[PDB]
Design a protein around this ligand. Structure first.
Ligand SMILES: Cc1cc2nc3c(=O)[nH]c(=O)nc-3n(C[C@H](O)[C@H](O)[C@H](O)COP(=O)(O)O)c2cc1C
Ligand code: SF4
Ligand code: SF4
Ligand code: SF4
Ligand code: FES
Ligand code: FES
Ligand SMILES: [K+]
Lengths: 45, 263, 432, 214
């Protein structure tokens, strides 16, 4: 609660590793909305 | 009805909506310079040789890609248009090799011809040139890729006409190179048509290599009989000998391609 | 009371209140600092009210070109056709000298995530892809954590902020390419192709990412949208000159005592900005050679112009340059201005996509010429040749990277032509 | 050395073994689902970057694996690999050192950093140390211009360097520790070195300045 403007509070990112970003994306998938569909599996289909 | 009126050099022409500035000029008889545009391939807009002034507009537009709008006046012979053409032609020839004597495209080269008609007459390039290594894409198409001007007509053709996604660009910048990346052959029943659409001597016919020159061939418009399609062809002869076979445009049969058995 | 002296922004009016990372970047603190506040009430007023707030503020794009943001976002506001609509947030951040977007993403991530929701609701989008350069790995992970915290708290997703509007925020990482910051070349990179810009038309608000209507907006342009809707459109326009409104983030670097990122009012005099926040030029204002007022693309300006130049879109256009990203690069008299600008041309040569002729060949050509000027191995006639070579690249290319390589050269010739020629004499005398 | 045509070698041929681990196959599943149905090719960049984090570099066989699972033509995956500079197509050392020498980092003496590293590791730019730990290269702006000079080793920035701060970083990496990223001077991020000229007051709280009906 003290307005201590003398410390760097962004220290979490010093523990991230090789798969931090893609692990978060995996957890986030349960939240996303259903994706829209163009209608075909690919432009080549 | 749905036609819109545009002006080409002050001359009224009625065009469908969606017509490009390059196609509007066709209807008055003016052919805009081009390298990357081909009417039977998708629009690319990368060579920048079709840049044309639009009256009362500060920036030139790529004619091949820009749809016309009502009331536009296209200035194809304007000072701003001509200076755009000399600049682009100046860039295209900066790294091009001095090969015309040893290059099979000599005499029928759109780079040579459009340099003469829309380019400067001299060079102010005082640096070294780019040299690219050559790639073997089969027994029928020879690649001298230092001559390539990166129009990606071979890429767009092979993807879209021949249904083969084997050609692409690798790298970027001045070192962007057309090819397959790996050692692979572009062997297709229609593969030999990249030779014609390549506007330069980067892709030439190996069987035809070095034998003749364009000006000395006699053209006989004949028919292919290697199958039952009936492709219209041109037989090039010189001194009573058949030198090569080329497609002849017939819209309702072979369009402007032929198979490699015909070629 | 039309204000006449601009600057001296008070911390009450600043937007990025955690610019320096001295508070909690996670959701709890960001809510303490006023982020995610009455976001529901903002979203229930609708796409028209939100856009009008942005139009009133006079907000212009903070990504370089500087287009009026309210007008630009209004193209999307049209009836659907059956295709989804998207918001692409340009966090490529690749303009040399520019590092403002880096701070927003890692120290105010929830200001961005809300701007995506507010900006998205204004344009009618279903989700926001946030393109971020692949080097900013730690910043991307902080952004992913914040987006998770917002998801778990119901602020984004199905029925976002208790409003009935559904919104997703996706974070996609690049692979190394300044050219993916170009708005159409960005879109292409999200689609899994080489980052090569597209010709326009069609415009992205017609055919964009995946072929769908799309607006591409800078990180800073989106990160201030919720605040303009909160504190008001009129509040924002009360800062800066007419038509150049708002408070801007500034990167001062080069030969200053204290290179720093800071927020300051628009139209702040350039001399005041360097002296007041960055600690002044290395060796006093008399040691200043030239200043690049907004990243590499903008032309440099000499010390004489720096005296009374205001840092906004219109003032810097008068001086034959541009605000750009507001990345101020400072060079002192010990600098080799020719070597300094030749290295920028070497940068653009390395970043050109190679797609179109004037830049694939022209930029590499200017690089070879600028390399000889550095040693003096040329003739004075080539300088007017290099000037004309640049004017053929400018305006004849697909994207504005071709422009961005010509303007650095034109600025050097415009203000330091005697310096160039002087070096050529020395080379001639030595090799005589 | 910046060649954009592939020539098969015994170590980099189409039959060189590569396959995503079962954990990384799950990560691809979430990657792919971020994009509309029918536009799986959007996943080419992240999936290739994932292939490189598992393997450290992209062999030609890894590229063909990405093409297979995404059902993209292999050439369109070769194009992406060559276009973007982060993708490594030759083996790089365990620590890939990248020194920004663009102008804003050049004006704060990034050559001293480049000379300091070259002398310590006994390599020149673009080479790999004999034991394969380090690979040095130059790079363009890394978006850390205020904190120049700066280098990136793997995914971490070490900023405001001095020709002895970097030589300490390298000593730790040889030892096995990984030094903490961030500025190596007396500042924590981008703030002015002289203890802040703005944002010194307490931040205002929720509801400050909100207009009439918000
Ligand atoms: C080579 C090049 C690089 C660019 N890089 C960025 C960038 O990193 N971030 C950005 O916001 N805009 C960048 N732009 C500008 C974008 O194309 C576009 O104008 C901007 O993202 C639109 O957002 P705005 O309206 O908020 O300015 C770049 C443009 C070019 C030509
Ligand atoms: S491609 Fe044309 S310009 Fe080039 S060497 Fe061959 S004939 Fe000459
Ligand atoms: S090989 Fe020929 S057709 Fe293909 S890009 Fe080069 S010049 Fe164009
Ligand atoms: S101007 Fe340069 S970066 Fe832009 S499309 Fe052309 S070659 Fe690519
Ligand atoms: S023909 Fe128009 S740009 Fe190539
Ligand atoms: S110039 Fe080196 S990080 Fe920007
Ligand atoms: K040819």
């Amino acid at each position: 609660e003290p307005f201590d403007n003398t410390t760097y509070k962004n220290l979490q990112h010093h523990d991230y590793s090789t798969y931090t970003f893609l692990d978060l994306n995996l957890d986030l998938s349960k939240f996303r909305m259903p994706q829209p569909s163009s209608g075909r599996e690919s432009p080549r289909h | 009805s749905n036609l819109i009126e545009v002006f080409v050099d002050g001359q009224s022409v009625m065009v469908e909506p969606g017509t490009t500035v390059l196609q509007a000029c066709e209807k008055v008889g003016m052919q805009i310079p081009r390298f990357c545009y081909h009417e039977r391939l998708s629009v690319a807009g990368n060579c920048r040789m079709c840049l044309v002034e639009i009256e009362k507009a500060p920036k030139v537009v790529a004619a091949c890609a820009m749809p016309v709008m009502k009331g536009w006046n296209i200035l194809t012979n304007s000072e701003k248009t001509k200076k755009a053409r000399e600049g682009v032609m100046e860039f295209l020839l900066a790294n091009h090799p001095l090969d015309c004597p040893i290059c099979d495209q000599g005499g029928e080269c759109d780079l040579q011809d459009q340099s003469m008609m829309f380019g400067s007459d001299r060079s102010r390039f005082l640096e070294g040139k780019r040299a690219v290594e050559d790639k073997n894409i089969g027994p029928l198409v020879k690649t001298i890729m230092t001559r390539c001007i990166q129009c990606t007509r071979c890429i767009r053709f092979a993807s879209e006409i021949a249904g083969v996604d084997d050609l692409g660009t690798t790298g970027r910048g001045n070192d962007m190179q057309v090819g397959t990346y790996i050692e692979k052959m572009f062997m297709s029943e229609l593969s030999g048509n990249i030779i014609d659409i390549c506007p330069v001597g980067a892709l030439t016919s190996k069987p035809y290599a070095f034998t003749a020159r364009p000006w000395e061939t006699r053209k006989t418009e004949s028919i292919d009989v290697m199958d039952a399609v009936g492709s219209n062809i041109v037989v090039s002869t010189r001194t009573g000998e058949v030198m090569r076979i080329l497609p002849r445009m017939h819209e309702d049969i072979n369009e402007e391609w032929i198979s490699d058995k015909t070629r | 009371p039309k204000k006449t002296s601009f600057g001296s922004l008070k911390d009450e009016d600043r937007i990025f209140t955690n610019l320096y990372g001295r508070h909690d970047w996670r959701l709890k603190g960001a809510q303490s600092r006023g982020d995610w506040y009455k976001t529901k009430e903002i979203l229930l007023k609708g796409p028209d009210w939100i856009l009008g707030e942005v139009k009133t503020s006079g907000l212009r794009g903070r990504g370089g070109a500087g287009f009026p943001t309210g007008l630009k976002w209004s193209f999307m506001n049209k009836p659907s056709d059956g295709r989804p609509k998207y918001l692409v947030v340009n966090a490529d951040e690749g303009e040399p000298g520019t590092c403002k977007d880096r701070e927003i993403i890692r120290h105010d991530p929830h200001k961005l995530v809300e701007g995506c929701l507010v900006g998205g609701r204004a344009m009618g989008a279903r989700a926001a892809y946030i393109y971020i350069r692949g080097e900013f790995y730690n910043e991307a992970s902080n952004l992913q954590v914040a987006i998770r915290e917002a998801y778990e708290a119901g602020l984004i997703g199905k029925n976002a902020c208790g409003s009935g509007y559904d919104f997703d925020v996706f974070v996609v990482r690049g692979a190394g390419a300044y050219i993916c910051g170009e708005e159409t070349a960005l879109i292409e990179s999200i689609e899994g192709k080489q980052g090569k810009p597209r010709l326009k038309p069609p415009f992205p608000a017609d055919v964009g990412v995946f072929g769908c209507p799309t607006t591409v907006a800078n990180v800073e342009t989106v990160a201030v949208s919720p605040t303009i809707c909160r504190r008001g459109g009129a509040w924002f326009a009360s800062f800066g000159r007419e038509r150049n409104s708002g408070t801007k983030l500034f990167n001062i670097s080069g030969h200053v005592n204290n290179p720093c990122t800071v927020e300051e009012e628009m139209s702040v005099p350039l001399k005041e900005l360097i002296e007041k926040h960055a600690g002044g030029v290395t060796g006093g204002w008399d040691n200043l050679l030239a200043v690049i007022p907004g990243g590499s693309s903008t032309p440099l300006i000499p010390k004489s112009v720096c005296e009374t130049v205001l840092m906004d879109f219109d003032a810097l256009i008068q001086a034959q340059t541009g605000l750009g990203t507001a990345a101020v690069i400072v060079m002192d008299r010990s600098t080799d201005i020719v070597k300094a600008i030749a290295r920028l041309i070497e940068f653009y040569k390395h970043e050109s996509c190679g797609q179109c002729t004037p830049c694939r060949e022209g930029v590499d050509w200017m690089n070879k010429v600028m390399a000889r000027f550095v040693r003096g191995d040329a003739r004075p006639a080539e300088i007017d040749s290099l000037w004309e070579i640049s004017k053929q690249i400018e305006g004849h290319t697909i994207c504005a990277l071709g422009d961005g390589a010509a303007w650095p050269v034109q600025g050097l010739i415009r203000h330091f032509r005697p310096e160039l020629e002087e070096r050529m004499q020395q080379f001639a005398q030595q090799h005589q | 050395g910046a060649l954009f045509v592939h020539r098969d070698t015994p170590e980099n041929n189409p039959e060189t073994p590569f396959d995503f681990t079962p954990e990384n196959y799950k990560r691809i599943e979430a990657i792919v689902k971020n994009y509309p149905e029918g536009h799986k090719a959007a996943a080419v960049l992240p999936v290739l970057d994932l292939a490189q984090r598992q393997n450290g570099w992209l062999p030609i066989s890894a590229m063909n694996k990405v093409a297979e699972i995404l059902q993209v033509p292999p050439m369109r995956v070769y194009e992406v690999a060559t276009f973007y500079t982060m993708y490594n197509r030759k083996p790089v050392g365990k620590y890939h050192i990248q020194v920004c020498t663009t102008t804003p980092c050049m004006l704060r003496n990034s050559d001293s950093i480049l000379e300091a590293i070259q002398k310590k590791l006994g390599i020149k730019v673009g080479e790999t140390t004999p034991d394969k730990l380090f690979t040095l290269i130059e790079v363009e702006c890394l978006g850390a211009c205020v904190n120049a000079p700066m280098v990136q080793i793997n995914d971490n920035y070490y900023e405001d360097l001095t020709p002895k701060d970097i030589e300490e970083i390298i000593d730790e990496l040889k030892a096995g520790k990984i030094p903490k990223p961030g500025p190596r001077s007396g500042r924590f991020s981008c703030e002015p070195a002289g203890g802040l000229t703005s944002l010194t007051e307490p931040p205002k709280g929720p509801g400050f300045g909100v207009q009439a009906g918000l």
